[PDB]
């Protein structure tokens, strides 16, 4: 693929090619753990993808292999900056801003695919989970660590995981903090497919292209519909929001607008009350 | 208004005029209690209204006053035909088919307004509740009777009532089986407005007309949206269904249709992936 | 089995034998796509099955093989009659009446089993999904096509699917519009069992008989309970409706009815307030 | 009424009369604040009432007036024994056992009526909220104090309050920590009725007697149904639990039991599959 | 108050004083309708407020009176820039970005109070609703207009409104598109208090100061708890996120961090498994 | 090294380190529970909950029986089933297993079902509501309600669906078939499968991996999982844990001290974080 750099960052790499964006967490010396700046940059990059009318799919992955030969998607919050009440940014502010990133990935009307090679651990595991889809390399390793390292994600990390692998397996994952292979992760329902490491990016590109040939309006409505099964009124906001969008493409709707601007009463008399 | 009979029934009366249909429960010797046939006919009448592209609003009310001077919207299930496991129809089958009627009124994409003069009691009270709106006459009397007469409605009768008057008041209504005035009913939030008896139908017509001047598409989407706060996936079905409806009016959607019929790949390349 | 024709239709075939009904979509020249009339007839047949006190289980399947040797359960909405805002009926009205069929299948207190040979695609796929159970032949092929053909089902097609195969696999199914084999469908959780094509009906009959040897009241309560995990207040309506049904079979409840009819205060004094 | 002491406690008083139980919080020197012992005892008394087949209604109230002439329902958690992580019991164990009491009151199949004279503040306010009904004396004063005293009830204290007074008023109550009169509390929807201080107990008894003349089975099903609008699967458990109870009173149900005991196949062939 | 300008914008004004921020929509020639830029700026200012450790409360209001003597909070989407599929920004992109602003106001851990003088109509009405609290001047006018002007808000505008005024009144508001006085709005439950126009800001400041003397941790937890009753897993994310925040302030939690950094197994053996 | 912790008629109850073991001991009825069995089970689980050293509870059945067969639990004892419920010795109809279900589900300790042989009917639902399930390869799972004139439309239905999905959950209940340990794992309702003589050791092994974790983290997580299912009751548990943690902060303590000292609280130093 001919990837073009789209913007420069300190902790990540960001590329575009056709309708695909690629976001790479680039802190291999920390197994691609995120510090607050990493989350800020990830958020910025995902926002850019959201605003780009040409991009329909974002591939999210980690830099590797590292000098020690190991692969990693993301090892979660950088523990070396963890202080009282959160992860300390350069101004001394404790933060949990990955929560904001989680929501953006979840709600943006573009499909996000996690491409996992090596470790997807802790907060890194939850990031893989909230991505729409996950493609794993056969060397991928999945797991949570919260109860061992003094943390937990009781939001999407728990409930949404249960909506993927079911309640028994979700609890096992969090309580024991074991590691799971790519094959185990696929069998339990949380990984869509598994390929060799050297095929991981091309598979992502293949899946991305099958989506890029579909109707953008259809895709965004379906993504909202899936969220609507989880996120109550916030889910309804996204789903109803797309209904409003589509309604704003109708003549019936436009008559309401035109009537207001022309200071006359609207005339919906020709329009039927359908069953 | 020039109401014209639209179809003949044994237990009810059914009229249409302009964009309004009027359905009248007609068993005043039973304070308008419904027997299984009454529910069958009500259901049929609402279906007819649903199918008529000219009808946007349905007024539901009870026949009166009766020979005793009393008014009644509906007194619920006819206890005189109640047998083992439900209300016995003319074929000997026990039924709780008012549940089907509740669902039809609740889901049909037309506004239904209960016009309550006199008693709306028991199953008759639940009917008023599931109508979109309620306009009451000053002589209206509301209440549940289940725990006194060996019944209960633990479906929309309970949960949906709580979404109207709040949990404290809903529990009071059901546990004590007291009666409530039109003013008390409005104050608690379950009656939209109150007018003198002789003004009841005309108020109904005025409210119907204010809705009939609105966009049918906007109205149906809103009704689905309101149901969506209550009915989980069934509510999602109605709201997403309207999104599908609207999407079927877009050129983007039509390309998908035409491509299939012409046995060619669709080309959505021109359409943007909006924010 | 000695199937007996139960009623004649244009687009479907309808049989009964013992406690089993069999409904067959009969438009093999369109891979059994449904037009509005097809849905009307399916709805009528399911209502009949619902009304028949002898029928406990309904088998739903597609006519085949076709003259080209191919099998199909259902290929979804007939694209050849699709117009603005829906599928255009013979009177010129745009419809999405499959939504009503979905609700009927989902809520009727009889077990519905989809018998899928060959294609269950698009709206045909959602139909299989909303059936209680699915038995597949080895030649079955499952998938959604919405984003490719300019449609989507963001109701039961999305949310309820996620409650079967989990969020990751449900999104994949819709975003990519691939086809899935029977073994794949079974592994992901949406097909209950797989058998050879010529053993499909006999498998359906056997499963039906195992249900028919059970308590009808127990089965209906369970079906409502499953819906209740999905359909919010609509689900409560079904579950509470069954509690009412059962309560109408009690002596305690009848004392309430009798008291009213005999115009005396009820006497529940003998009855305990159990823990 | 002739109240009889039913069991002796240190921190509360417990009486019975006919089908009514009365539980009185008795620490007037602390405006009836609860310490862990108080909660243990309250739980015990409510359990007793639950196990007593003669008791249908429980009245909950505070001892008063105090020597200063002041009335109090309950001032919440006893701050004088609050320590690290909770309220410290006599063994040094930090506890939040009022959460267990909230659940018992909420789920027990008997109606609980809070009789509030004077202060219902903090955890004392939440206690009034979770009781089925609330009757207030003219001198009643309601409010939350968490954000002022370094606490919060983000459980039934927040969500369930919103289901009573609506989201705007519920947020106001908690954010500002003001006090509300009986009239204000009634108008907002969280108090069922208001009576003079010296009529409070008689009003409680009158409401209780109106409940005690109803069907105990109807009442328990209704209470479960109301919970089911709030408590997801736990609510389904209560409601389905009652359906099971009712089914266990049927001959159809008994056929299953007998068949098992007699080591024979059950015969449900005579029973219909109702609509 | 000595308000200080905090940042310069085109469509709005932004001030700070003590723990209070004030955001003023400043397009009085359009009754304070928002165009995409207005939303962009509102979003930025609310983000600024969120990031300011000194700000606990945000007052949101409209500029007025206008040259015509009229007051307005906000009249919703600027119809003069509405085009196909949304509101057209300065780059030609159709947007519904008020949806993003809604989520920010709803989720940010500071109390937002709408100060409504004059019109809060359509999208402007939904903005007032999603603020935590609303204080109205006695000249305030509330209402929705969607079905008249060819729009609807089927997200928070519908469901969340029902959680404030109940289902009956919410439907009325949307279906008829009438106007409601401050008094009617308070009576129905969606306005917290009403004061004279000349007292509106001082009342806002008064309420803000009562919140500013409270515990910030308590307030954020409560706000998340209220959202959790509406927003399913998204609500859980906020509520669990705060639990994580608090857990990150515990010694027990830090031991997990330290063990990881020091490359040793954690020792939680000293910590109890509390009831 | 198990130590008897309390004596019961229908069950056995032990502790060792941070693990409690509760054993249903009515093998002559395939460990069916009568109201007393449930009362004792509730009592034992309450004990475990109240025991500050206990972090994990293993639940299992006595076996093998004299007929060589294993059983976790065969559900409600049909031999005492009467009108409206299971008749206790004072003549009262009961459904008190529902109370046990809630206790197991809500207690801030991990409960692991160790299933050898039959987990059937109400016994099957008990395994389901336990946090985790470890099965021996001879384990057999299933529901029987519609066959024996009962049903569990609460956690037995909805919660099962949140484990195996709607299609499989309905199959299980409608047909009342039996499922192997391997089948149970493949569908998602069993965490792992081992040989029968390795069953207890696997449970102990799993318990220990949990006992080395943070008790606060584990309780918050269990509540968080319940919250995806139990609406406001789930919120009560989750928010309750937030309150617990807030009661460990200085900020929170200022509010208490201020009240006790009859002075206005001073939270002025504390930030309004993002
Ligand atoms: C990822 C894993 C399993 C890999 O193990 P291994 O291959 O053995 O690598 P190693 O552990 O040796 O790590 C290599 C270097 O990267 C650092 N490193 C790795 N992960 C790090 C991290 N998360 N923070 C800081 N440094 C890290 C290491 O400390 C080490 O650095 P040096 O000693 O060479 O200097 C293994 O490394 C591992 O278990 N990492 C920890 C993962 C973890 O526990 N994450 C959860 C923290 S909580 C969280 O993510 C979170 C944050 C916000 C909101 C919610 C949340 O749940
Ligand atoms: C409605 C009410 C309060 C009116 O009282 P009142 O003005 O004193 O009239 P009265 O009680 O004298 O009744 C007049 C005649 O109509 C009959 N009548 C009135 N309502 C009836 C009914 N529901 N069934 C059969 N006959 C009825 C009466 O029996 C009486 O007949 P006669 O003595 O002249 O022969 C007062 O009449 C009253 O309280 N009726 C009871 C209403 C009630 O308790 N409904 C609960 C049944 S449960 C239900 O609605 C339901 C059904 C299916 C599914 C779910 C459900 O919740
Ligand atoms: C089913 C499938 C995959 C089979 O492929 P194939 O075996 O190759 O058959 P072929 O494509 O040649 O089709 C055979 C004939 O049946 C027609 N045909 C098949 N399906 C049709 C349909 N759904 N409508 C009209 N004509 C159809 C075809 O046009 C063709 O006719 P002729 O050339 O001989 O004239 C393959 O045929 C296929 O993919 N069909 C379309 C499936 C599809 O995209 N369905 C969903 C549309 S949206 C939906 O159902 C829906 C409905 C309600 C609510 C929400 C919704 O999303
Ligand atoms: C209740 C109220 C408003 C009454 O005011 P007032 O009439 O003026 O009485 P006063 O404040 O003087 O109190 C009288 C005496 O009772 C004690 N007292 C009153 N309430 C107490 C309490 N809750 N704990 C310990 N001692 C108490 C006082 O400290 C005082 O004792 P002495 O000086 O004579 O020694 C006014 O007293 C008041 O606001 N009290 C505090 C109420 C409060 O803030 N409760 C919340 C605690 S957090 C919570 O309840 C909670 C706990 C567990 C779970 C969830 C929860 O939400
Ligand atoms: C607010 C209201 C009721 C006041 O009426 P009035 O006092 O009589 O003022 P007037 O109607 O004359 O309007 C004054 C000027 O401001 C403009 N103006 C007022 N509102 C405007 C608006 N929303 N957009 C553009 N220009 C506006 C007017 O066009 C007029 O301009 P000029 O003629 O002098 O040039 C009355 O003005 C009124 O009803 N306005 C429209 C309210 C409305 O229908 N809002 C809904 C739009 S849909 C939406 O908000 C939305 C957007 C995104 C997502 C969800 C959503 O619901
Ligand atoms: C478990 C199972 C499949 C074992 O089969 P098998 O190995 O062949 O043993 P067998 O059937 O011979 O039973 C052995 C003895 O234990 C008794 N026994 C076994 N289970 C019993 C039980 N549950 N109650 C009373 N006695 C029992 C039997 O009657 C038999 O006794 P004797 O002949 O020696 O006298 C097989 O035994 C079996 O299917 N048992 C019945 C399981 C069942 O249907 N449970 C459903 C009750 S519903 C419930 O649990 C419930 C409770 C509360 C709320 C909701 C609910 O759904």
Residue numbers in the entry:
A (entry chain E), B (entry chain A), C (entry chain F), D (entry chain D), E (entry chain C): 1 to 275
F (entry chain B): 2 to 275
Quoted from the paper:
1, 4-Dihydroxy-2-naphthoyl-CoA (DHNA-CoA) synthase, also called MenB, is responsible for conversion of o-succinylbenzoyl-CoA to DHNA-CoA in the biosynthesis of both vitamin K1 and K2. It catalyzes a multiple-step intramolecular Claisen condensation reaction involving two high energy oxyanion intermediates and two keto-enol tautomerizations in the formation of a naphthenoid ring. The first crystal structure of DHNA-CoA synthase from Mycobacterium tuberculosis shows that it forms two eclipsed trimers organized in a homologous hexameric assembly, in which each monomer is comprised of an N-terminal spiral core domain and a C-terminal helical domain conforming to a canonical crotonase fold. In addition to observing the folding of the active-site loop into a well-defined structure as previously seen in the substrate analog complex structure, we have identified a significant reorientation of the C-terminal helix as an additional conformational change caused by the small molecule ligands.
Through symmetry operation, all the trimers are found to be a part of the hexameric quaternary structure of scMenB. The active site of scMenB in complex with SA-CoA is also very similar to that of the ecMenB:HNA-CoA and scMenB:HNA-CoA complexes. However, no hydrogen-bonding network is found in the scMenB:SA-CoA structure. In addition, a bicarbonate ion is found in the place of the chloride ion in the ecMenB:HNA-CoA or scMenB:HNA-CoA structure. scMenB forms identical polar and nonpolar contacts with the adenylate moiety of HNA-CoA and SA-CoA in the complexes, but shows differences when compared to ecMenB. One of them is a strong hydrogen bond between the strictly conserved A-loop Arg-82 and the backbone carbonyl oxygen of the C-helix Gly-253, and the other polar loop-helix interaction is a hydrogen bond between the backbone carbonyl oxygen of Arg-82 and the side chain guanidinium group of Lys-257. For example, the side chain of scMenB Leu-261 on the C-helix forms hydrophobic contact with the A-loop, which replaces the interfacial hydrogen bond formed by the corresponding amino acid residue Asn-271 on the ecMenB C-helix. In addition, the adenylate 3′-phosphate group of the ligand is also stabilized by a ligand-induced salt bridge with the side chain of scMenB Lys-263, which is equivalent to ecMenB Lys-273. In the scMenB complexes, the lp−π interaction is formed between the purine moiety of the ligand and the backbone carbonyl oxygen of Lys-30 accompanying the hydrogen bond between the Lys-30 side chain and Ser-80.
